[PDB]
Structures are given as C-alpha cells and as structure tokens.
Amino acid sequence: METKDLIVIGGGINGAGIAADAAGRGLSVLMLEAQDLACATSSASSKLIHGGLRYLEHYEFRLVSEALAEREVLLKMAPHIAFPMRFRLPHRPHLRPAWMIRIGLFMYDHLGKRTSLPGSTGLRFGANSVLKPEIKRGFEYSDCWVDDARLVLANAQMVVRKGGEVLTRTRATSARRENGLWIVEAEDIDTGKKYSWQARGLVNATGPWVKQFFDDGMHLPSPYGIRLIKGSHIVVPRVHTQKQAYILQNEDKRIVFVIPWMDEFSIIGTTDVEYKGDPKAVKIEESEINYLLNVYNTHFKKQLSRDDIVWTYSGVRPLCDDESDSPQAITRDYTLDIHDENGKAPLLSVFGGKLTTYRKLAEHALEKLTPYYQGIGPAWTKESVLPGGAIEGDRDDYAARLRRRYPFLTESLARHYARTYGSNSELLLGNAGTVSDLGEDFGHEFYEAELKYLVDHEWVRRADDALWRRTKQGMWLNADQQSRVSQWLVEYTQQ
Numbered sequence: 001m002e003t004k005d006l007i008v009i010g011g012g013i014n015g016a017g018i019a020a021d022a023a024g025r026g027l028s029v030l031m032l033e034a035q036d037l038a039c040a041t042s043s044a045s046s047k048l049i050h051g052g053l054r055y056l057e058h059y060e061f062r063l064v065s066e067a068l069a070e071r072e073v074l075l076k077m078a079p080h081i082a083f084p085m086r087f088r089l090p091h092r093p094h095l096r097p098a099w100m101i102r103i104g105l106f107m108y109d110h111l112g113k114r115t116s117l118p119g120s121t122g123l124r125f126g127a128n129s130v131l132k133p134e135i136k137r138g139f140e141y142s143d144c145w146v147d148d149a150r151l152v153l154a155n156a157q158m159v160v161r162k163g164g165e166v167l168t169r170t171r172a173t174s175a176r177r178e179n180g181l182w183i184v185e186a187e188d189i190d191t192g193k194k195y196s197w198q199a200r201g202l203v204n205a206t207g208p209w210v211k212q213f214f215d216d217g218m219h220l221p222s223p224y225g226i227r228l229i230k231g232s233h234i235v236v237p238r239v240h241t242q243k244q245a246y247i248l249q250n251e252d253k254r255i256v257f258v259i260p261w262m263d264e265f266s267i268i269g270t271t272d273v274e275y276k277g278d279p280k281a282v283k284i285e286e287s288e289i290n291y292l293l294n295v296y297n298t299h300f301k302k303q304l305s306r307d308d309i310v311w312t313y314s315g316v317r318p319l320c321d322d323e324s325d326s327p328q329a330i331t332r333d334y335t336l337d338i339h340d341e342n343g344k345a346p347l348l349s350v351f352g353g354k355l356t357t358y359r360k361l362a363e364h365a366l367e368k369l370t371p372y373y374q375g376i377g378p379a380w381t382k383e384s385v386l387p388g389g390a391i392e393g394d395r396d397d398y399a400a401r402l403r404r405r406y407p408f409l410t411e412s413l414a415r416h417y418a419r420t421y422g423s424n425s426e427l428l429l430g431n432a433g434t435v436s437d438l439g440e441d442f443g444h445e446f447y448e449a450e451l452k453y454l455v456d457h458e459w460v461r462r463a464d465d466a467l468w469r470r471t472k473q474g475m476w477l478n479a480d481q482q483s484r485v486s487q488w489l490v491e492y493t494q495q
C-alpha cells in the first residue's frame, strides 16, 4: 500500500497548510519541497496578518472580510510568532479625503469578527513627532505581525505530528495519471536520488511556479495564467523608538509600510513591479530603493540615505491573472481549481493566496478534495494550536517563565527562544543546565544546541535555512561566523 492518499508539491505556506489540514483529516500525506521550506515567496512578505485595508478601494470585500476574521484565529494558533500591532496612517488630504478614510476604517473594524483587536482612532501630530511638521493629522488601527517563514515551519511540523511526511531538497520533476492513480517522480537536488510515488490525489501549490509545473511537469493546460508581481523591502536601523508601524500614502495611490522589526530595525516596503523570469533570481533594483526611500523621506523628519540600508529582500507575488492593467490593481484573492479524470486522480491547483488567508484556503481545498476520500475527517484547524504555540502569554508569560525554569538563560536568549520556538524550547534545551551545556557559541547567542535542534526538528540543511528562514540571526553574524555555521552543518549532516 505504498500509495499515498495525497501528495502536495510545494513547501511554502499554502502547500504546508493544505498538507497539515489533510493529515489532520486522516489522509496519508506527503509534501515535497524543491529546496527549503518557505525558501521563496513565503519568506519574502511584509510579514503582516492584515485584512488588506487598501483592497477596499477596489471593493475586494470577500477577501478583506475573510482576512480580517482570520487574524484572531491565527493569533491563537501561533501566539509565539504572531502578535497584535497598531498602524498609524498619516493624513494626506490631496490624496484621500478624511471622510473616505473613516468609512474604510469602519469597515475594517466591523467587516470581520473582532473579539480582541482594539478599534480605530484619530491622531494628532505635533512639532515633536517623528513626521514632518506639515503633517498634522492621522489615524491608527489594528492588524498583526507574523514570522512568515516560521508560520510555514509550524505547519510542516503539524504534518509530521499527524503521521504525515515532509521531504525537502526534493524537486518533483513530473506527475501523470495512470490507471486511476497519480505517478509522481522527484529527485534529490543534491544527491540525484530519484523517487517514484503513487497517489490518489495531487495538489499543485508551487506558487510562482504553478503554471510552469503544468507545462513542464504534467504537460497539462493550466486553468489560469499567473502574473508575477515583484515586491521588495529594505531594512535599516530602527528609524524611531515607537512600537507602532506607519502606513504611508504615496502619490501613485499605493501605500508603503514602515514596520518595527526585532526591536533594532525598521522594515520598509513594499513595491509592484511586473516581473518575468526565474522567481529564484528576483532581487531589488535601484528604482525600487529610490521609490521606498522617497516615500519615507517625504513623511519623516529623520532622513534616510542609501548608505543606511543594512539588508534588502525581494520576492514575486504569484497573482491569479485577472488581466488588470495595473500591478497594484491586480486582485490578491486566491483561486482554487480541482479537476479529475474519470472521477479519479483529482488535481487541485492553487493560484494566489496571501499568508493571511492560508488556513481558510487550505480548508476550502480539502473541501473540494473531500468527495474523493473514504471517511475523511471534517475541518479542524480552526480550534487547533500549531506546534510551538502551547504557551501562556509570549512575553506576558513564556519568556519570563522560561528564565524562571531555566535560570542560566540570559534575558535576551530567553526572549529569542520564546519568540522563535515557543513551547518547543524545552525540546531544544533538552537536559541543559548551564550555558556551557549549550555547546559552541556561533555568535549573538546562537548556540550549537539551537542549530542541532534546527537540523533535528526543523529540516535545516544549509546555513541560510537556519540564519535567514528559521531565524534571522543572519542579521548579526559576520561572514566568518556564517561560514562556521555552514562548516558545522557539513560535519553534523555528514556522520
């Protein structure tokens, strides 16, 4: 019975969420990721769990309402990596009238069930604010921040938690129907080891590659086109000490975020640039930098230059091509397509789908796949808690409680584990009783005990996986220290 019930191609947020949900419904599931979990679009987001305020002008009510309500659901599912955040919108009357803004905020507050997130409010900016003097009025509202790459990992762990299988660095090369079953072929991108599996169902959740897999992997016609819209972000030492984020209205009608990041930086993003080519080669261009710095510099007193940038990242949104002439106007809602052959071997493909709406998307996916499976269990993820989320507060409790239980833990390290691993911290600490038991110090309190844990429980294979996806330690480790991390991984993944 080597036949899996469902095979999921794609290890980003959408593929992980679908696989986890499926496994939790009793299906024998296998998820395939060509490189590393969240190595593409899912680790290149603005990292916000938002309802999509700007989509209201386009009347995308279905998406905005679903997104808004999911915020609190995700907040309870992964309290260790997600949390409430307040956003400040500077008023720019020549762009949008005050009455217009208020209507939007009203919908944003009632368009979706809001049990804990505070309501919107008006703001007054004085001569001592961070914004320029001419800007005197604004508004503030709620939304959430989430460690995108880690939300993906949490779901991958869930898959395994429920008897599922997850393979990384394994690229699916082909898939075709045969005798009522799917024959999926894949190969280890490193060793060349080939695999061949049989499945009763197949999900194409390869994001930017969705159509590409239809053409080269299955030789089947894709039900939808895909618009690749690149978006980049720049990182700089925090521009101010305030805990809230700002949402700026640019002259082209787009909005740009300035978000507090890891207490030391500010993330500024994003952009909408039509893109063509390999989604893996995407990178920020000069005009993007000029565009993000300008909108920031026109709003804040403290001026930023190109020289203040400490890091940048970019990714491409795989938006379902609605033929919109304007990249910023293209819809952000997702579309799912399911098709079978003679009532068997269904194929569910995913087009679009924000990180914010992934759980709902995954639920709707299993809904379409239900008719094809035995006594498949019903929905369940809404009342679940992702691995690492079984805490009691986050900072409120966990970080404090961790140092209390593991006194040798400095306040910074305790904060890191709490905000990264959550309830999985005790598994990482194992029998450690002192700092020395944590092993080699690679820098910035990133110990061997953490890296060993990442390889054993978080599929880490390369340094980048560990320093830029499972964590953001890459922001502090110098070139030699990162080289050492890679060297350790070789020696550990060797024998």
Ligand SMILES: Cc1cc2nc3c(=O)[nH]c(=O)nc-3n(C[C@H](O)[C@H](O)[C@H](O)COP(=O)(O)OP(=O)(O)OC[C@H]3O[C@@H](n4cnc5c(N)ncnc54)[C@H](O)[C@@H]3O)c2cc1C
Binding pocket: 009, 010, 011, 012, 013, 014, 015, 016, 032, 033, 034, 035, 036, 037, 038, 039, 040, 041, 042, 043, 044, 045, 046, 047, 048, 049, 050, 170, 171, 172, 173, 205, 206, 207, 208, 209, 213, 230, 231, 232, 270, 271, 314, 315, 316, 317, 318, 350, 352, 353, 354, 355, 356, 357
């Ligand atoms: C600029 C930007 C900002 C964003 N901001 C936000 C925001 O703050 N909030 C929010 O909710 N959303 C945001 N998003 C949207 C969100 O990031 C994406 O919608 C989501 O990550 C898409 O996930 P995915 O799983 O569909 O695709 P991906 O994350 O791209 O995953 C697809 C995966 O498939 C794998 N794959 C491809 N081919 C194969 C193959 N043949 N075999 C095996 N594996 C394969 C890839 O390696 C990859 O990991 C943003 C997106 C962009 C880029």
Ligand SMILES: CCCCCCCCO[C@@H]1O[C@H](CO)[C@@H](O)[C@@H](O)[C@@H]1O
Binding pocket: 091, 093, 094, 096, 097, 098, 099, 136, 137
């Ligand atoms: C302008 C002096 C009275 C104080 C009100 C705060 C100023 C911002 O008020 C704004 O002014 C705009 C025009 O500039 C209007 O179009 C409005 O949308 C708005 O209410």
Ligand SMILES: CCCCCCCCO[C@@H]1O[C@H](CO)[C@@H](O)[C@@H](O)[C@H]1O
Binding pocket: 097, 098, 099, 100, 102, 103, 106
């Ligand atoms: C039902 C929810 C809608 C609430 C009504 C929104 C009206 C906002 O109205 C605005 O207020 C600004 C400041 O007073 C103004 O300066 C005004 O000129 C006006 O444009």
Ligand SMILES: CCCCCCCCO[C@@H]1O[C@H](CO)[C@@H](O)[C@H](O)[C@H]1O
Binding pocket: 053, 054, 055, 056, 057, 058, 089, 100, 101, 102, 103, 104, 105, 249, 255
């Ligand atoms: C009768 C006309 C009513 C139209 C109300 C549309 C709601 C406005 O939505 C607006 O979207 C903007 C970006 O798109 C955001 O910057 C604003 O915060 C938001 O109020």
Ligand SMILES: O=S(=O)(O)CCCNC(CO)(CO)CO
Binding pocket: 156, 157, 158, 160, 161, 387, 454, 455, 456, 457, 458, 459, 460
């Ligand atoms: O911690 S979990 O059980 O959720 C996932 C453990 C995954 N372990 C691997 C070891 O190579 C990846 O780290 C895969 O078996």
